[PDB]
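User: Can you help me understand a structure? I only have the sequence.
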Amino acid sequence: SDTGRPFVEMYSEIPEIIHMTEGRELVIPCRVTSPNITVTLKKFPLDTLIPDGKRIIWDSRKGFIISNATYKEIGLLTCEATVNGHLYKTNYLTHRQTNTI
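Assistant: Let's start by predicting it. Here is the structure, written out as tokens:
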């Protein structure tokens, strides 16, 4: 809901610890009730991971699907949406599981 809360899946306080790996697919699961709402994928401090729609594919009903994960998606990501004059947001700490044997 634009009025209630746009996010279907969203944190509380502690960022979601995603054990990722570079090269492979990385989903940031901050989907919303409708694409029209339009979420912006930020990263700490104030970086913007623009949904290019090739590598970073924004699936409103799943998450931001970074098909080829890179160093660019290692850190505190933050999905943000100022919908009905209210900053709704949710955080995702993308931890690489270093030596992914």
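Now, to help you interpret it: Strands lie at 16-20, 26-28, 40-43, 47-48, 56-59, 63-66, 75-82, 87-96. Residues 9 and 64 are 12 Å apart (CA to CA). Let me know which part you'd like to focus on.
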